[PDB]
């Protein structure tokens, strides 16, 4: 139990009680030579992702991906960090390899849509996010990307229902509500945006997007 408790404690959510997660990470690193473990790396990548440390995300995830390039737990954070750094060649290579590796997974089609978004081709991302969303109902990234494709396309009425639908399927995740509030900003409807921004900020006290909005 001395090691099992820490291993279980690793996998909970990172937004709250973050410091204990780090302390447990170093606890695992000492006396158990489990620093090379993949799941410790996943925990650190998600930790860096929470504070938007995208460069540290890329370096560590490139170190872990060289050993294994198709760990579906690892990949979503890597795709997000690639899209944040806005580099298209690495995303293109990874997405095209994953497309020919796992054709029936939603992650690869989500990656193709992200590549098109890095290329600003909203029309193809529409279909290639719809496919990923259909393939996996529990893939919140697909709903947020889908509503983003509506928003960047030019029309927002359908994106409104898309962000609302994303919020309803996944209660307790602030980010779809935050994106929906930004769409309310885009439509100049601030009354609902006040409450929505407050609810999102209830669990995200320190992040650039919430404070900027």
């Amino acid at each position: 139990k001395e090691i099992m408790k820490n291993l279980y404690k690793i996998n909970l959510s990172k937004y709250i009680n973050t410091e204990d997660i780090t302390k447990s990470n170093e606890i695992l690193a000492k006396d158990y030579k489990l620093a090379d473990n993949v799941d410790v790396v996943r925990s650190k990548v998600d930790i860096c992702y929470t504070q938007c440390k995208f460069n540290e995300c890329l370096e560590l995830c490139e170190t872990v991906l060289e050993n294994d390039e198709f760990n579906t737990n690892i990949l979503p954070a890597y795709i997000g960090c690639l899209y944040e750094l806005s580099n298209k060649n690495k995303l293109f290579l990874l997405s095209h390899r994953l497309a020919e590796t796992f054709p029936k997974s939603a992650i690869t089609w989500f990656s193709v849509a992200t590549y098109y978004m890095s290329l600003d081709r909203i029309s193809e991302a529409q279909k290639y996010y719809s496919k990923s969303s259909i393939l996996d109902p529990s893939f919140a990234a697909a709903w947020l990307g889908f509503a983003h494709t509506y928003a960047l396309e030019g029309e927002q009425d359908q994106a409104l229902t898309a962000y609302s639908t994303a919020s309803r399927f996944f209660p307790g995740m602030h980010l779809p509500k935050l994106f929906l509030g930004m769409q309310f900003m885009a439509m100049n409807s601030l009354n609902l945006a006040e409450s929505y921004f407050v609810l999102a900020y209830d669990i995200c006290p320190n992040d650039p997007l919430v404070l900027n909005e």
């Binding site: 997000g80 899209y83 947020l144 983003h148 909005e213």
Partner: protein, 35 residues
């Protein structure tokens, strides 16, 4: 996850027209004073 591109404020036409007008009366102020 796909982070949204943050919204960016835009320099409207109305406020810049207001400022350019204010500058026109600003220069018009001392031209009669000089005379």
């Amino acid at each position: 996850m796909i982070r949204r591109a943050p919204t960016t404020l835009q320099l409207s036409h109305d406020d810049v027209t207001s400022l350019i007008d204010d500058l026109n009366e600003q220069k018009l102020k001392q031209q009669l004073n000089i005379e």
